[PDB]
From Swiss-Prot, chain A:
Component of the HAUS augmin-like complex. The complex interacts with the gamma-tubulin ring complex and this interaction is required for spindle assembly. Disulfide bonds: none annotated. Residues 1-30 form a coiled coil. It is found in: Cytoplasm, Cytoskeleton, Microtubule organizing center, Centrosome; Cytoplasm, Cytoskeleton, Spindle. It comes from the Eukaryota. This is HAUS augmin-like complex subunit 3. Contributes to mitotic spindle assembly, maintenance of centrosome integrity and completion of cytokinesis as part of the HAUS augmin-like complex. Belongs to the HAUS3 family. It comes from Xenopus laevis.
Length: 50, 52
């Protein structure tokens, strides 16, 4: 009984960890919709600087 | 000779009775220990799982 419950807890834990990882990824600011273009030209935008 | 042998036979039966008596007293203690071990396993290892 102890081995069986142990397996169920592990499966739930692995699923829980994977979900947290995905949520963290989806909350990345660069992925989030059309923030109003930045008013300042990004240092990485070489064309606008030129 | 028979009396001696049978005296020795009685000695053997008595020595065995002593061993059995000692053996049965030890078994009684072991059963008590096994009962405590099983209860301790349920309390320490199984009862905490529902919370996890």
């Amino acid at each position: 009984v102890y081995r069986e419950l142990g397996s169920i807890v592990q499966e739930l834990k692995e699923s829980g960890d994977k979900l947290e990882e995905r949520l963290t990824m989806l909350s990345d600011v660069n992925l989030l919709s059309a923030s109003k273009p930045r008013s300042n030209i990004d240092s990485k935008d070489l064309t606008s600087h030129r | 000779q028979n009396i001696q042998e049978a005296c020795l036979l009685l000695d053997k039966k008595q020595k065995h009775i002593q061993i059995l008596i000692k053996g049965n007293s030890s078994s009684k203690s072991q059963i008590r220990r096994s009962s405590v071990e099983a209860q301790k396993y349920v309390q320490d290892k199984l009862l905490p799982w529902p919370q996890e």
